[PDB]
Amino acid sequence: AALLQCTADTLADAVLITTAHAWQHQGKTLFISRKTYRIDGSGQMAITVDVEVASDTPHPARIGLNCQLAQVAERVNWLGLGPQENYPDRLTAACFDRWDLPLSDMYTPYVFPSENGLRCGTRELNYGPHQWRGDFQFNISRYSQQQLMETSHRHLLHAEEGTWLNIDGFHMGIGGDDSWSPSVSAEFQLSAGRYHYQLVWCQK
Amino acid sequence: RRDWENPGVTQLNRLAAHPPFASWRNSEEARTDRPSQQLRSLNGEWRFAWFPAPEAVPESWLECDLPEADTVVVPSNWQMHGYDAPIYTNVTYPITVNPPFVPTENPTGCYSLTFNVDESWLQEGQTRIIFDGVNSAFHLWCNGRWVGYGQDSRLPSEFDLSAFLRAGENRLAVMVLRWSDGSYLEDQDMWRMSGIFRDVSLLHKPTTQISDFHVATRFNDDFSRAVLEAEVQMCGELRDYLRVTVSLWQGETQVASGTAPFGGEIIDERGGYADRVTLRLNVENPKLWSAEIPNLYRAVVELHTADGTLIEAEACDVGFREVRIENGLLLLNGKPLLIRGVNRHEHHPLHGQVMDEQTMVQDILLMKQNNFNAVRCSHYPNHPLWYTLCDRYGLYVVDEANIETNGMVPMNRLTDDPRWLPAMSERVTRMVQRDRNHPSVIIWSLGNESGHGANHDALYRWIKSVDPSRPVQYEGGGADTTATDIICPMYARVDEDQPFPAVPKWSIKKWLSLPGETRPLILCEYAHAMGNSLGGFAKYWQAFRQYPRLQGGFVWDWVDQSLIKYDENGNPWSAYGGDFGDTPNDRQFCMNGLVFADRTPHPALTEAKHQQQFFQFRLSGQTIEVTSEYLFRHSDNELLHWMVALDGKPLASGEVPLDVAPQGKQLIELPELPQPESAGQLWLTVRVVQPNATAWSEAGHISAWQQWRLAENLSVTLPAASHAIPHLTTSEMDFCIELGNKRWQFNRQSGFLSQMWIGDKKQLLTPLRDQFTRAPLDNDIGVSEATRIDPNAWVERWKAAGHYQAEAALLQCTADTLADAVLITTAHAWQHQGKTLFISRKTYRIDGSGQMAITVDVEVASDTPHPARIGLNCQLAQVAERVNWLGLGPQENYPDRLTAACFDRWDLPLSDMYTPYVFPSENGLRCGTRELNYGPHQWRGDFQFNISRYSQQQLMETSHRHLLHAEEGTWLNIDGFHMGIGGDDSWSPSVSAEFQLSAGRYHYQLVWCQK
Ligand SMILES: CC(C)S[C@@H]1O[C@H](CO)[C@H](O)[C@H](O)[C@H]1O
Ligand SMILES: CC(C)S[C@@H]1O[C@H](CO)[C@H](O)[C@H](O)[C@H]1O
Ligand SMILES: [Mg+2]
Ligand SMILES: [Mg+2]
Ligand SMILES: [Mg+2]
Ligand code: NA
Ligand code: NA
Ligand code: NA
Ligand code: NA
Ligand code: NA
Ligand code: NA
């Protein structure tokens, strides 16, 4: 990320932080992310994200945010598609309802490790003291995308401190018509160019 | 007798049908197709009188001109002369259904003519008169004596007047009935008119004459050899001395000829035809006819004596082509066709159903220029000249019998009834007898919308037996009956099934593979172009290209059937059903064309041209792959032009000669490119241009195009620090923002931007407000009507849900001053009867730069019908001359109808941003727009827009374009999203799901900045 702008403003009943970032590679701008974080008197933080993706870069795997939480809670509760892992082109079996599972169940132990455990069409997610609201897809677990990507076998995965949360506005299909040539269908590729999403983060 | 109320009598004393004759008495004239002194036109001024019923016609009329008659032009439709009203009804018959009777009040046209006949014509030979088209039935008298009667409004009726004429002056009397039992088989969806509407002529033939002739052409496997066979029949006295000679010419060169006395081969135990003979000519490497290269030869048939004295000659254009269905595919000269067709009715806004050469030529040229290669004579045999033009300019034709009994219950009531077979049979047989020698006719059709009856099966088999050279098709009864060689549905969808009982309309892709099915599929009608339509057109093309057995289709239809009427100011205006007092009527359903009545294009036309292109393209790095869809010709009148532009700014362009074989490819390597000196999206646009003029196109004609996005450079450079900061003034009723000479006012009671100033000049006539509806298109209304609502129609869903009546309730309106800007926040709910339909949350950020940034986030209740659009609208105080945008264009384009439009910088007069559909509706949208300029205003973002002098309200309350009146200022509709327009049909919801606004949550943002 290359910071482009970072400002803070005081509102009648809130504080407004505006940011803008660029991700580049060898001088090419791949993505631009513009956000606002509005913190009001109720303790709620409303994050608005507007992203641009260069039309000529390969459509990205996802459009979201991530962070490592200090908290390690026992359960995961959400209002969205479940209870099992589901992806945009693999979610017809999942039902929209209130789901509550132990944390470990939010991780799928594929022998060869990868991105996993996403849940789509979620409107509310609760973990420990935290609560996220909006319309997003998410995964939660003790393994970072970095570790998963670097470990060839599930038995060698190690829980990291805390919990990794990947909350996405958009996520690419997983495909599978075959596993030797690109199989994700156009309609599940993130090729819109401009994407918008919003999340509210709060406590309890 | 009341012959017009008896389907057992369709003519009295009428001569047999045959192919076009001219009775030349000079071979060279026949060869060159020059006018024949033996074929005279009687078109021109005639005498005419109108009566309410046949019983009111005075007998004196038979021998003497009625003083009260008028002199009028013939051919003509009398309704077009104001004698009575033309009637527009679609399915329901214009008369009480009570076959075979017609109303007692039956408008009767009494036509007459006094003309001269040369003595030479009567000293020898036979003089007949020919009525190419009389609607719907008539009796004929000559010199006061009764001659005969005829039915079938769309085929010539011929009568021998040899015994009735005298040298010098003679008087014809023709009593034309508007309604007859033939009207039961004439229920096509078009204006119901009457009169002597096709040519009238006199033909002189010798007593001993060529009475008929049939030309057939067969070939070897690869079409490098052919055999032309001509069967010729004679009437008159057989003499051993008679001979027939058939010669074939290519240009001025005679390539083959054969001569024989009459006397055909043995046919059965009783012998053969002594009055016939068939000549067979070999043709090596014939030049084949196709719509791509309509090569023609001339066959001349001479009847003469052995000593060589000519008796008479006939002749026709011959096109060497084979039509056959094999292994499921319709082949032409052994290659599979891809029909880029259109249905075309014979319609003229001024002249009604009378057709003229100039109009026909204009139609053919526009069709070809727009990539059509075929036409269906919906739904009757056409004026004879039509076939000659299609043979010479090159179009595949479906010739269709004049049989349509749509308004019967059930549809096949008459067609399954044997008492109706005879009337039906002549409508089929007489067509074939007349048109079987035209190369352009490649398929025969049994008629239209008359269910499926046993009569159809009989006639299907008759044609197969008499003319094996052309497939036979018929859609009635489910489009795949035993009476069709082609699955030829009307309005079947690409992917969606419509499982109607008894006559389902399956998805075309699914239809081909039904168990046991093997035929090709070509839609007889699809993409109903009524008003703002052709949404989903590209969907059909993609499928036709991917499935071999999907061989295309015929769009419905070519031209709007509107008629001219004149206002109080004598200003002509376009009229539709009901405008002539006709009732019941089908209102705007008579207007479904790609072009307006005067042949001006509707926007859908370009979508069709683009989808029907004959060259396909692919882009790989710097290589462009061009593939030809021509089956027979090389691209020998084509060059490729390419242009690279950065956000509309030209950067580079070139041309490359195209040399592609039919169905071949060519790879063109593009030049290394300079770099764009700045941020933006680079786009590549290519076009195929024909440098040379052709018989149907001008030099420089653009036949195909395509664009792609190349590199894009995202803008990351921060603008410049503005040195001014806007100021907010708060009052009880408003929030006002001032930035030097500019001001913006937000009303606190409404929650909207109510006024804007540049100096002291107010910019708005109406506040900027959200808009979620549109003035309904014809496809949104479908067959719904006030007196009979169709609750499933989109318009009725929206109406019932209150979308049109919804009122905005303000939820919130606040003002915040930022460091360098003022921030207005609002929220509104649109409710109806207690239900919240939509919620709009917005922010307006105004900074030192004078730009107003608007963000919009809308929630739409999942249970309310998906809205027509999600946008804003306002009435601007300014009226400017031009409209300039960076987006899709230049013509009107919608989400499901935008493939033809290209992304570039466009600039047009404001009036061209309005599409004048006869029945007004939302129109003129342009999509994928990043910048819009109008007067001192500039809007940037990624939206769809329309701009004009008419509000959506006016458009929806005005039923005829001529009654529209420019409002003050300019109405601007800017949409973050807009629903598709549909058009698979105009009677049931046809907007595909992917083009419906069903996301639930929508986000868009715009920046408005001015001078
Ligand atoms: C309105 C439908 C019930 S019938 C529909 O009407 C159309 C109107 O242009 C065309 O005439 C079609 O051929 C006919 O099938
Ligand atoms: C004579 C050519 C047009 S086709 C010619 O017809 C022959 C029968 O006459 C045979 O069928 C040959 O195989 C065929 O090539
Ligand atoms: Mg009759
Ligand atoms: Mg009909
Ligand atoms: Mg395109
Ligand atoms: Na891995
Ligand atoms: Na095909
Ligand atoms: Na009506
Ligand atoms: Na119609
Ligand atoms: Na060329
Ligand atoms: Na209207």
Swiss-Prot record, chain B:
Matches recorded under Pfam families: Bgal_small_N, Glyco_hydro_2, Glyco_hydro_2_C, Glyco_hydro_2_N, LacZ_4
Residues reported to bind substrate: 90, 189, 449, 525-528, 592, 987
Effect of mutating residue 189 to F: Obliterates all binding and catalysis
Regulation of protein activity: Inhibited by phenylethyl thio-beta-D-galactoside (PETG), isopropyl thio-beta-D-galactoside (IPTG), L-ribose, D-galactonolactone, lactose and 2-amino-D-galactose.
GO cellular component: beta-galactosidase complex
Residue numbers binding Na(+): 189, 589, 592
Stored InterPro entries: B-gal_small/dom_5 (IPR004199), Bact_Beta-galactosidase (IPR050347), Beta-gal/glucu_dom_sf (IPR036156), Gal_mutarotase_sf_dom (IPR011013), Galactose-bd-like_sf (IPR008979), GH-type_carb-bd (IPR014718), Glyco_hydro_2 (IPR006101), Glyco_hydro_2_AS (IPR023232)
Keyword annotations from UniProtKB, A to Z: Glycosidase, Hydrolase, Magnesium, Manganese, Metal-binding, Sodium
Positions with a binding annotation for Mg(2+) 2: 585
Catalytic activity field: Hydrolysis of terminal non-reducing beta-D-galactose residues in beta-D-galactosides
Superkingdom of origin: Bacteria
UniProt: Mg(2+) 1 binding residues: 404, 406, 449
Active site, UniProt feature: 449 (proton donor), 525 (nucleophile)
GO molecular function: alkali metal ion binding; beta-galactosidase activity; carbohydrate binding; identical protein binding; magnesium ion binding
Effect of residue 589 to A: Decreases the stability of the loop 794-804
Site label Important for ensuring that an appropriate proportion of lactose is converted to allolactose, positions: 987
Annotated site (Transition state stabilizer): 345, 379
Homology family: Belongs to the glycosyl hydrolase 2 family.
This protein's name: Beta-galactosidase
Organism, as annotated: Escherichia coli (strain K12)
